[PDB]
Scaffold this active site. Sequence first.
Site, short mmCIF file in Angstrom:
data_model
loop_
_atom_site.label_atom_id
_atom_site.label_comp_id
_atom_site.label_asym_id
_atom_site.label_seq_id
_atom_site.Cartn_x
_atom_site.Cartn_y
_atom_site.Cartn_z
N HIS A 42 88.35 37.51 21.63
CA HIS A 42 86.92 37.36 21.82
C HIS A 42 86.21 36.76 20.61
O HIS A 42 84.99 36.55 20.68
CB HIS A 42 86.27 38.69 22.20
CG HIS A 42 86.66 39.84 21.33
ND1 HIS A 42 87.82 40.56 21.51
CD2 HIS A 42 86.00 40.43 20.30
CE1 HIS A 42 87.88 41.54 20.63
NE2 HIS A 42 86.79 41.48 19.88
N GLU A 73 94.72 39.55 24.67
CA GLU A 73 93.55 39.76 23.82
C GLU A 73 93.73 39.19 22.41
O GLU A 73 93.08 39.62 21.47
CB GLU A 73 93.17 41.25 23.76
CG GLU A 73 91.73 41.55 23.33
CD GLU A 73 90.68 40.70 24.04
OE1 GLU A 73 90.89 40.33 25.22
OE2 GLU A 73 89.63 40.41 23.42
N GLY A 147 81.93 45.86 14.35
CA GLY A 147 82.33 44.96 13.29
C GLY A 147 83.70 45.26 12.71
O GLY A 147 83.98 44.86 11.58
N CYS A 149 86.63 44.55 14.67
CA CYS A 149 87.60 43.57 15.14
C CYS A 149 87.45 42.30 14.32
O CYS A 149 86.32 41.86 14.09
CB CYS A 149 87.45 43.29 16.64
SG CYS A 149 85.82 43.33 17.34
#
Lengths: 182, 183
Positions: A42, A73, A147, A149
């Site tokens: 992401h 992911e 905050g 990842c």
Amino acid sequence: MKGPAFEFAVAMMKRNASTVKTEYGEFTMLGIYDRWAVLPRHAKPGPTILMNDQEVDVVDAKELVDKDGTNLELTLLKLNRNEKFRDIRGFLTREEAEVNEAVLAINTSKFPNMYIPVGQVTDYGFLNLGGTPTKRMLMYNFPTRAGQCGGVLMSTGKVLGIHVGGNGHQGFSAALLRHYFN
Amino acid sequence: MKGPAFEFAVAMMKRNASTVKTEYGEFTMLGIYDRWAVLPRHAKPGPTILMNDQEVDVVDAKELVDKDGTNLELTLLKLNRNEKFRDIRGFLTREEAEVNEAVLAINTSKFPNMYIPVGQVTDYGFLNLGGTPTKRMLMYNFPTRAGQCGGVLMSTGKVLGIHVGGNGHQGFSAALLRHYFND
């Protein structure tokens, strides 16, 4: 919580990690080998990124899915840069790993060089990440914050996964498997 | 970066640290021995604190100054609680200590269970803190952030001090000297 695990993690981050802003936010990024790095999917990096406050061209990018198209992911990305990453593929597991004590290392402007003992890591497997079925998730229990990842989940001599989500007291990483780079 | 420092900090935080709110902010708080704990002076605890989201009465509070009245930027407080802290006075140094590798341990809602390798620790000495002359300042270099004050500064076998300030790439602690906790 072990001493060797923290010392390894600090050395890993100083040598291979950086802070990366994309148009979707600010992330920890782990260099793997050559010009190849990894981000949480992401982060959605574009043709250029900000890496340690510097614009860097992204010359290739692969969002990882398993053999039946299921999300993992993770996004691999190849940077236009002369410095090579220290080759850390030898620290990556062949298969989803579990450990008794792991350390999550964060390197963002919100959390500059922060290390969190998250305790045991479970090869949890399947998660639905806000609509997206996802596999090869590793789970761990700790007071999560925004905050984080993609912090680097580590143990002594082990790069286990990239932190890709969490809420309340549950965090999860995508297993950083060595055949993604083989 | 040092492993022994981290392992010691984890053990110390696990047993003696808590998250504390006063009227003025949220702080890491390290218990020292019996019912005595230590806060940055500017935490300014009142008659009652929130310790792990629970009201705890403050029995005694002592803002520390040296023999010539110079602020030491520390407040010692005695809590009304039945559980006793593990006695960790044996990990306090007798005078301001210097180490090549220290860890700063934070546990607040803004930094939950976080450990920062800050590297070398210098006996810096005198600092003018917000107009207040202060002594026994330990200092170290790392990318600082707001809300880290009260962080516990530690190395192997040593609780070095209490993080009381910083900015830019420079943080500083009040030295946590052993003789502060006699009796």
